[PDB]
């Protein structure tokens, strides 16, 4: 078990134990387990983070500007913005997707991936 802490510039977003942490980095997809070696990585523009805990359903978060840092004791994602799956809006995510603005399109794609529509 590893202590995840999704922290954002405006405020910290989520913190707590989790068994698995899946995401997509510039290098590629990465799945972090409790004793993962120390690492620093940059998430892709439309990255999504799936944290899998015990006793609860897996949690999907859409991240803008996330940077992953994995340590022997704890893991922290420095996210410019982060939204939980429960509050994601399907129509808004679709409309934001494929926008001429790369930032908006990436945010919409991250929202969809967190939801699952991709």
């Amino acid at each position: 078990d590893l202590n995840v802490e999704i922290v954002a510039v405006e405020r910290e977003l989520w913190s707590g134990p989790a068994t698995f942490v899946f995401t997509r980095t510039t290098a590629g997809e990465i799945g972090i387990l409790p004793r993962h070696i120390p690492l620093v990585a940059q998430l892709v523009d439309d990255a999504m983070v799936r944290v899998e805990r015990e006793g609860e359903d897996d949690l999907r978060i859409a991240v803008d500007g996330g940077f992953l840092s994995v340590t022997e004791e704890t893991v922290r994602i420095l996210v410019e913005n982060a939204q939980f799956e429960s509050e994601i809006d399907a129509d808004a995510a679709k409309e934001d997707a494929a926008s001429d603005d790369e930032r908006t399109a990436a945010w919409g794609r991250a929202r969809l991936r967190a939801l699952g529509q991709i």
Partner: protein, 83 residues
């Protein structure tokens, strides 16, 4: 000297070399593919389900050459050309 004896000895040596090369290539290719699969799984343990397929494609590609060499060696040892 018996022509058949020399011809068959040459055929046996050639087939042995055929198997030597085929085994070398197949084994090292299989090891390389397994290394790629292991690295991928370590990167993302849940990715094995989708990783198996390309790995099996590579294994097919290498094992095909291996068994082609098997067939040609079998031709050599049993059906010796120009015997």
């Amino acid at each position: 000297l018996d022509p058949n004896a020399i011809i068959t000895a040459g055929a046996l040596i050639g087939g042995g070399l055929i198997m030597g090369g085929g085994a070398i290539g197949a084994g090292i290719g299989d090891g390389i593919a397994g290394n790629a699969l292991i690295s991928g799984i370590a990167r993302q343990p849940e990715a094995q389900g989708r990783l198996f397929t390309p790995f099996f494609i590579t294994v097919g590609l290498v094992e095909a050459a291996y068994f082609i060499n098997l067939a040609f060696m079998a031709l050599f040892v049993f059906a010796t050309p120009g015997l």
